């Protein structure tokens, strides 16, 4: 199907005399494939997928140099931001960015992305056209002007349409056994009385990959949108994900409820019922 490559970057200044910390994590869909971290004491703290290890030192050294240089850019960014926002040098602040590309099943580019946040609030992002900036805050007008004078959108666009797509296609092939395999959810339905008038029906989904899933509860074929409780999708710790949807139903009316499970790994969607 379709695939995405994303890098999730963080640069954080720290309390007192503490050195800033820099991290870059690359994902293909929900699979982490590389991690660069200034806190890393050895290659073990910069884990990488086996299909990245196979690229050898030319790849690793080139990406390590890019990370090291990007860290110099982020140090200046952190200093400029404290100036824009009239903040003390003593504070700890966080700069993050997410960037990368989406391709269809044929490998053709669908969309490029490049967004930045400061202290967890959107700051500036490349528009979908990859030719202009959208500024979330007043101060981002300053960055936008500097980036217009330096033709940064053209450079980011070249990477997003070119390098990003070519390498995403390469990783999908080299890591095909893990990246192109969709694990369907393992499902079940549990019942939990709450009172002598009502009970909770909980629809479970475990062991699925990718994280994207749709769990709905229906009454007589009708969607129960307002009354469905959905937990945030959570990692199992083995690359798979978990989620549940719950509905409070009247005692005796459980046969009227069905759980609908939609996932890319399923040949056909599931319709589930409580089976005592």
């Amino acid at each position: 199907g379709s695939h995405s490559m994303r890098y999730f970057d963080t640069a954080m200044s720290r309390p007192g005399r503490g050195e800033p910390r820099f991290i870059s994590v690359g994902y293909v869909d929900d699979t982490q494939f590389v991690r660069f971290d200034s806190d890393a004491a050895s290659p073990r703290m910069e884990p990488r997928a086996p299909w990245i290890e196979q690229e050898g030192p030319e790849y690793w050294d080139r990406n390590t140099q890019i990370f090291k240089t990007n860290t110099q850019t982020d140090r200046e960014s952190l200093r400029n931001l404290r100036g824009y926002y009239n903040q003390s040098e003593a504070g700890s602040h966080t700069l993050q960015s997410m960037y990368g590309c989406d391709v269809g099943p044929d490998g053709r580019l669908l969309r490029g992305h490049n967004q930045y946040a400061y202290d967890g609030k959107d700051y500036i992002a490349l528009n979908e056209d990859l030719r202009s900036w959208t500024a979330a805050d007043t101060a981002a007008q300053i960055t936008q002007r500097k980036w217009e004078a330096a033709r940064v959108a053209e450079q980011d666009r070249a990477y997003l349409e070119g390098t990003c797509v070519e390498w995403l296609r390469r990783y999908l092939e080299n890591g095909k056994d893990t990246l192109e395999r969709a694990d369907p959810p393992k499902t079940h339905v549990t019942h939990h009385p709450i009172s002598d008038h009502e009970a909770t029906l909980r629809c479970w989904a475990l062991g699925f990959y990718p994280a994207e899933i749709t769990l709905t509860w229906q009454r007589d074929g009708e969607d129960q949108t307002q009354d469905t409780e959905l937990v945030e999708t959570r990692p199992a710790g083995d690359r798979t994900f978990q989620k549940w949807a719950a509905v409070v139903v009247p005692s005796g009316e459980e046969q009227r409820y069905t759980c609908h499970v939609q996932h890319e790994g399923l040949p056909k969607p599931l319709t589930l019922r409580w089976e005592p």
Binding site: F36, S77, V152, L160
Partner: peptide, 9 residues
């Protein structure tokens, strides 16, 4: 493959 960023915020 990482993107090289040179221009600061």
């Amino acid at each position: 493959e990482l993107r090289s960023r040179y221009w600061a915020i």
